[PDB]
Amino acid sequence: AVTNEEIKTASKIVRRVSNVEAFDKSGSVFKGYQIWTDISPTIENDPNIMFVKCVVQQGSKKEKLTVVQIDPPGTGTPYDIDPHAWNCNSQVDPMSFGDIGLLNHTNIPCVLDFLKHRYLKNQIYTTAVPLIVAINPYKDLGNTTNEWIRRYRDTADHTKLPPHVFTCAREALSNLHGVNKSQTIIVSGESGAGKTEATKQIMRYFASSKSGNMDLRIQTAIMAANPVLEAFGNAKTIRNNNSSRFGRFMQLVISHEGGIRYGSVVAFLLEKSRIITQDDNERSYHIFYQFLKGANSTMKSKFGLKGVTEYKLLNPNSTEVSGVDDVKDFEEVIESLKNMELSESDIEVIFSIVAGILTLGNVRLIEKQEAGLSDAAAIMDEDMGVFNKACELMYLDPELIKREILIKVTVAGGDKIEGRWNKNDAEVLKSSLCKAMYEKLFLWIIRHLNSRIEPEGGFKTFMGMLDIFGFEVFKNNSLEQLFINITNEMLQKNFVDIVFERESKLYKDEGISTAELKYTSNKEVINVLCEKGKSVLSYLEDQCLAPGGTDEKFVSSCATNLKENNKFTPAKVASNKNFIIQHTIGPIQYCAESFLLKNKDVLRGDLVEVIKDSPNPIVQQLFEGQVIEKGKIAKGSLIGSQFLNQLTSLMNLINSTEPHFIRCIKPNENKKPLEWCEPKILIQLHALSILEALVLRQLGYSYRRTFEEFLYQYKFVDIAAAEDSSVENQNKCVNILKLSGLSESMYKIGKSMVFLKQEGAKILTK
Amino acid sequence: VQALVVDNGSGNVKAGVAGDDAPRSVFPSIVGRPKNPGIMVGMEEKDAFVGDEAQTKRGILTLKYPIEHGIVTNWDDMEKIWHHTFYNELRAAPEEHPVLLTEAPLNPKGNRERMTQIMFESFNVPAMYVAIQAVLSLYSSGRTTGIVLDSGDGVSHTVPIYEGYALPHAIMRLDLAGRDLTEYLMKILHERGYGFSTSAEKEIVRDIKEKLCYIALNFDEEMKTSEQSSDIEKSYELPDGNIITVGNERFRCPEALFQPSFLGKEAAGIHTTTFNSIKKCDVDIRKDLYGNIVLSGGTTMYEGIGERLTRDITTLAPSTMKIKVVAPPERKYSVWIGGSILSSLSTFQQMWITKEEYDESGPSIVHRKC
Amino acid sequence: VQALVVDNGSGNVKAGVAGDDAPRSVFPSIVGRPKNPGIMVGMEEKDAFVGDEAQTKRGILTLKYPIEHGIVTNWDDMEKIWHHTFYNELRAAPEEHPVLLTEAPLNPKGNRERMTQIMFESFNVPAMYVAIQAVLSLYSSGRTTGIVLDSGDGVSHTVPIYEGYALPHAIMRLDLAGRDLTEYLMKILHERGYGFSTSAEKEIVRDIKEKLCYIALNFDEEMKTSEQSSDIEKSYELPDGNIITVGNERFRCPEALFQPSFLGKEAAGIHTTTFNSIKKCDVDIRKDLYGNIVLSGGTTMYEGIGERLTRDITTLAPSTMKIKVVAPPERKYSVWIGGSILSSLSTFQQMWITKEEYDESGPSIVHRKC
Amino acid sequence: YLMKILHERGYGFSTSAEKEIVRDIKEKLCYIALNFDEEMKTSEQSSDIEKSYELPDGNIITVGNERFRCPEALFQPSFLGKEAAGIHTTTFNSIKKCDVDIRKDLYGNIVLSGGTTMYEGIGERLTRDITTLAPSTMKIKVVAPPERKYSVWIGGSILSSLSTFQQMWITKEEYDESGPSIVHRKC
Ligand SMILES: C/C1=C\[C@H](C)C[C@H](C)OC(=O)C[C@H](c2ccc(O)cc2)NC(=O)[C@@H](Cc2c(Br)[nH]c3ccccc23)N(C)C(=O)[C@H](C)NC(=O)[C@@H](C)C1
Ligand SMILES: C/C1=C\[C@H](C)C[C@H](C)OC(=O)C[C@H](c2ccc(O)cc2)NC(=O)[C@@H](Cc2c(Br)[nH]c3ccccc23)N(C)C(=O)[C@H](C)NC(=O)[C@@H](C)C1
Ligand SMILES: C/C1=C\[C@H](C)C[C@H](C)OC(=O)C[C@H](c2ccc(O)cc2)NC(=O)[C@@H](Cc2c(Br)[nH]c3ccccc23)N(C)C(=O)[C@H](C)NC(=O)[C@@H](C)C1
Ligand SMILES: Nc1ncnc2c1ncn2[C@@H]1O[C@H](COP(=O)(O)OP(=O)(O)O)[C@@H](O)[C@H]1O
Ligand SMILES: Nc1ncnc2c1ncn2[C@@H]1O[C@H](COP(=O)(O)OP(=O)(O)O)[C@@H](O)[C@H]1O
Ligand SMILES: [Mg+2]
Ligand SMILES: [Mg+2]
């Protein structure tokens, strides 16, 4: 159910902007206006609700609003509230349109009642514009079959269609075969919010065409190989038994005569630090556990496997999860590898690499106080059979791997000298070895899934799709959740880019100066989190290279150097263990425990060549490219630096294309249809930045409507102008606007639409 | 973009581009001029041979080092070495990169002011920080708490640092280094029967000092056991083809570091200036300073300097504390490697001395950012 | 909900959440500032080290206590200690809880007014009572009738209470405490041959004073038997590794509490200010005040202070009454524990000073609820 | 400390005889400034603060700031890295450790002694520092006599040339009785 961190967090999300409207005229008279309040014993008794629509009682004060609880139907007892009173759009059926920008009031409870009413009427979609909003029904609504594909695909008019996946994907393919520009659909949300389901809706809509209806094997190949990316790629967090800790990104080439014929999967931003340590209620990547429980006695006897609590890379107290089988799922992993046609010998080598990683993580180190140094990194005695077994299962010469772990060698003017490593730095070598072997294993099998389905000439233009997360709003955040919020600031900057671009060019097309539209600057947060030389990540590179670096020195170094901007702020409680960033969605707190355990990644090319010299051509295909450096990789081998390179390339792949956006929200935590819970849904509104996307929606001339829809919608305001049809429709509409008492600053006269601000929209609807 | 880390050593300029693990250029601080006029027409004149070419032609050159005890005594020679270092050896222009020079502690102010005056007037460097060799060796040591005893060819520092804070009332330098050990080695080889007088002969004495000298554990015991010449005598082959037979001069050659009265100096040994620098610190941090005696420099490349240094300090220190010297391999380059790690930071890039700031304050700004 | 009990001790801030038996935070009232500039780039600057971190880095810090004799001499340092206490050590916000500060009797009014001005203006505390350390120690004593002699690092109170009624004409304070005994211990160690001058050296003298000093039964007899040094000499190991050999300075180190003319003060001893506070009470309650001499504070943690105090008072008192000192274990925390028991009552919650009441009367309301 | 700042100027004195040459420089050239920051800022423009000195080698020493930062470590000991207090703050701190009646008679007689009070303006700097620290209603009168190097020994004459003081010696037979501990009974 909903928890007190969710009730408290969602309670902190609740803001107040617009004042509550109670009056008809200048006299102290009410109209029976329905409001919203957070003070109700229903909310104090039902945690599924945070807002109660009431009705303002007659003869109440201006400073204190007497209300009767009507939605939900509590008792008819008039109780008093602080004008904690939010405006409502009571006169509007939510099934009449699907764009929250058409709501007069865009506070939080009108959006919760609009999406609440539409979800409870089994209308799970809502066009934010240019967003779309999906809510999981936890069932089939039937509107996803091939007949609805033909209906939302084949009509000549598409703006008379209700909000859907198929409508926005239709806009994307129409923009594909219209103009040769790549479109990219970004499915964002929590990993349990049905992003795979809406993904499969995009896969059947792209699959289905007018002639090439099912003339593809691409959805068969990728969707058959779904539990490989889910096998290696999903880990339990405190939010999901099946969380997606990276981004699947599928570039699909669409026929004009048919559907998908070519495509590729590329994952992006695969978290590596999860392999080494985890949290308490967090699993590792599942393939470790379901490999330790799904294997037979030949695979366990050959690999020397152990119990699921006897691996130090693995969280020993979160191995057992009721929602995940971890036994028969592994058979879907084996057959799902056979769906991309990998031999059982090669699959046996794959899980030999996996068993070698889990075996390698048990190898202990010791400090030898008798060397030339102070301490010396040494491998423990009884872990030597563990180590030789580990390189044997990874098909590596263990003497040369031990050479790369315990001995550094450099040449200085013609002098090969062998330095000895420290214990903690050799732990960074072993951990970096496990993480690099895991990720290049993952991308290797992704290269086999793409080896079936690729365009062999490359991607000239394509049709991209990005499975991606949302803002981890919650409290105990770390380096991984910092990377999450950085990626969401990049995607947010892309959102303000494309919304300012469409609205700026649409001001241009109607003869309106775009200087009255304002760019909401994401540049401060991107500078504080990413700018090379003055960021948080640059100083984390410093504390990886500052030799006596701790985590208190990191938070304090950022506290003393990033004080020029308010977007960094040191937290009050435990001011060296917690730092608060002013993101675009607001203050997010970060715990500082074990930063340097997570960032320190030293993948030295001297080891990379030893792994490229493996007798196994599989292992030779694991590390491809990645030339030797022979100097410091300390500027680029960190998880911060690799994260900025992969994030740089991914933002190069999305900024080069034209995007279209999908917001996936899941209503409850019980996986039940038509169960509504305003806290977790509100956290998903703030966590996909849907509220701030509505702020950008209500930025500028928000409420525009075409002249025919203004003269049809507001026909009854001035019936003498709209029914004339001799005076021009522009003059009709501005006669309606001047009739209702609107200054010319609030409306601009288009050639196809009437341009209204939210102030002009609220004064117009009185 | 990347900085340019130059170690102006007293006997080896060690320079290279930042972000590396070893210097690209390890070449000695030698300016040689030909004592003989050239007679073959069709050759290069080249009145100043600088660097390693001056050492490969050592038989026909007056070889001079511009660095006497960490201090430039001839600025034209040092400008030739910097010019060769930047243009002819690193092959990178000074305008393209910031340079990171380094400096002995208690170096006179004229070396900083004249040095940065050269690097902004003669070379057009955009930005430059000069630094202490010892604190850079403690960057490369992997610690932030310890005592660095440096020993190059001009200096022998003992800089203690406790948790990122320098102790400028406890920096004790010492003018015992590789050059005084080469000169003393020449005197005891005058005692054995070999006469080395010129500069190239001093370099041959330096190769003997590298390949044959080692620090004894107890010097009197090695003298008394070396009265009966059994294995203490060794051989060496020259660039003439002869044979050098050394006796006591393997273990009395570096013993002048620990007993400077062999050199006739009224100074203290490396163990007594190190321990004397421990006693000039405050009495709480000494446990964290007896624990990290970080060696550095090429004059700590002998055999058993960790063993002799631990038994000498352990004799001097209170016996309840363990003395743990840190003698890493590549301790010759522990300055330069630290110069990489310092220049490859993001906070440190707020600490350069820009071109316009020198154009405002002159050289005195270097005494405000050091 | 639960109050927040903070003991602003002169040498140990002892703070913790109410309803406990021991403080969560026992850390000294030290603000240290670095006397040396930092030189390692990639560190925390942190110009004011507050609390226990300032004591773990004591060798590189000027360590200054803001409490001279129960009186704040520097309000910025005390505000840093409260800020560290609330946010960095207890990890509880001041807005979430009421705070219960405490105060040595006959403290000047500027400490109360400036103190509550800080706790309502700087920190946003909803409600706060300040209290007397001695009456809180008598809450934790389990009695309502007795004499508390407090002795911290600034003060030495003698507050008598007979059956819940204070005797404000008999509160006698004394400026003899742990800090004057550390200073006097430094002077007699100057007599033995050890020189402790700095602040970290004063803290080492405090550790010697804790581990080695004990109150003699009869001081002249221990001097005459300690003329023949048999077992009175002890050893101690420093953070340098040396050996301290103490002789008379085990029993003349705390003897200045009982004979203050060693410190050159024209005051009276703890036994004569205690007994002198008995004689300033009325003549009926003294039987109930000779019976409960409640010790408190960390300067009553010596050996035989109950025995010496009973024989001194028993010498001074009429011989027909028994003198029964109460020396409980955890008498260091008897203030704070009482601060729990006082703040965990239901009647006491009618006695806070709310935020709006300070917003009405200003700080003068604290002189109406004390 | 004068050797360290002469390492800063460009002179290296390391041995013991070199320390004695540094002592002759410290006697002939060091003087206490009236206000140290003002003398630093006026000595940024080197006009008359630089002086010369001739060694027993025949060279020339040119001193700059090291005439007035050489004895300034007496008043600001943090130049020497010591956590102690200056002469004015240990003197005034010794006034505050006395009782509060005699201080008028102790602010009035600050008697200098010893050879490290032979600088220039130590009376002036000491009076302005104590006068800054003391309450302003009392006059601070330092007594800086000539021959203050010998004020110990001269007093040792005047003490030993008394008739009452001859009742206070420690005789040979009394040491032969008590041993050295009798010196802790007559001091
Ligand atoms: C490896 C070298 C030499 C040889 C091949 C090495 C072999 C080993 O020497 C000998 O055995 C010969 C002998 C010698 C004579 C008696 C004896 O019980 C041992 C050796 N020594 C000598 O004749 C001295 C004469 C000398 C001049 Br003039 N002033 C000097 C000042 C001090 C000392 C000695 C001298 N001698 C050869 C030289 O200096 C010449 C200039 N040395 C060199 O530049 C190089 C080539 C060093
Ligand atoms: C535990 C300590 C020291 C040592 C390890 C402890 C051992 C025990 O001391 C000795 O045995 C040595 C000796 C000493 C000499 C003769 C003697 O019959 C006994 C002891 N005492 C001295 O040299 C004095 C010199 C001194 C300075 Br200047 N002004 C002073 C003012 C008053 C007294 C004395 C002095 N001395 C060592 C110090 O002050 C230093 C600064 N002390 C310390 O900060 C810490 C480390 C204390
Ligand atoms: C009065 C004295 C010297 C001279 C006659 C005085 C004149 C004035 O000095 C110069 O002008 C020459 C120059 C110098 C160079 C550059 C400059 O901008 C100013 C002066 N200084 C030097 O070469 C240093 C070299 C040095 C050694 Br190695 N380690 C050192 C550690 C720290 C500093 C410097 C050094 N130098 C001469 C010495 O130490 C010798 C050993 N000094 C002495 O024992 C006595 C005789 C002091
Ligand atoms: N293997 C060795 N054994 C003994 N001495 C050596 C060895 N290698 C170098 N040295 C001495 O150490 C010196 C190194 O000087 P250097 O490392 O350049 O210090 P600096 O950089 O301060 O000049 C050389 O002059 C040489 O004499
Ligand atoms: N075991 C001990 N023996 C002797 N003195 C002690 C001992 N423990 C603490 N002290 C002294 O008591 C002092 C602690 O007093 P404290 O309880 O903090 O009083 P306050 O709380 O008023 O500051 C310390 O300064 C210390 O010198
Ligand atoms: Mg060097
Ligand atoms: Mg106390």
Residue numbers in the entry:
A (entry chain F): 2 to 84, 86 to 768
B (entry chain A), C (entry chain C): 6 to 375
D (entry chain E): 189 to 375
Paper passage:
The macromolecular complex necessary for force and motion production is called the glideosome, comprised of an atypical myosin A (PfMyoA) and filaments of the dynamic and divergent PfActin-1 (PfAct1). Plasmodium falciparum, the causative agent of malaria, moves by an atypical process called gliding motility. Actomyosin interactions are central to gliding motility. PfMyoA is a divergent myosin, sharing only 28.66% identity with non-muscle myosin IIc (NM2c).
Here, we report an atomic structure of the divergent Plasmodium falciparum actomyosin system determined by electron cryomicroscopy at the end of the powerstroke (Rigor state). Using likelihood-based reconstruction of helical specimens and a real-space modeling approach aided by molecular dynamics for the refinement of the model, we present a structure at a resolution of 3.8 Å. Actin-activated ATPase assays showed that the phosphomimetic mutation T417D located in the hypertrophic cardiomyopathy (HCM) loop of the PfMyoA heavy chain (at the TEDS site)23 resulted in a ~3-fold enhancement in actin binding affinity while Vmax is unchanged. The use of a PfMyoA motor-domain construct with a T417D mutation increased occupancy of binding to JAS-stabilized PfAct1 filaments in cryo-EM preparations, although even with the improved occupancy, PfMyoA binding remains sparse. , There is no electron density at the active site of PfMyoA in this reconstruction that can be attributed to a nucleotide. This structure thus represents the Rigor state at the end of the powerstroke in which no nucleotide is bound to the motor domain and, like Rigor structures of other myosins, PfMyoA adopts an inner cleft closure in this state. The JAS peptide and the ADP nucleotide are seen without ambiguity in the electron density at the same positions as in the undecorated filament. The binding of PfMyoA to the PfAct1 filament does not induce major conformational changes in the actin filament or in the motor. Similar to other myosins PfMyoA interacts with the filament through five canonical structural elements. These are the HCM-loop (407-430); Loop2 (625-643); Loop3 (566-580); Loop4 (363-387) and the Helix-Turn-Helix (HTH, 540-565). In PfAct1/PfMyoA, the activation Loop (524-539) is not part of the Rigor interface, as is also the case for Myo6. Despite the divergence in sequence of the actomyosin system found in the apicomplexan glideosome, the PfMyoA residues that are part of the interface define a conserved actin footprint.
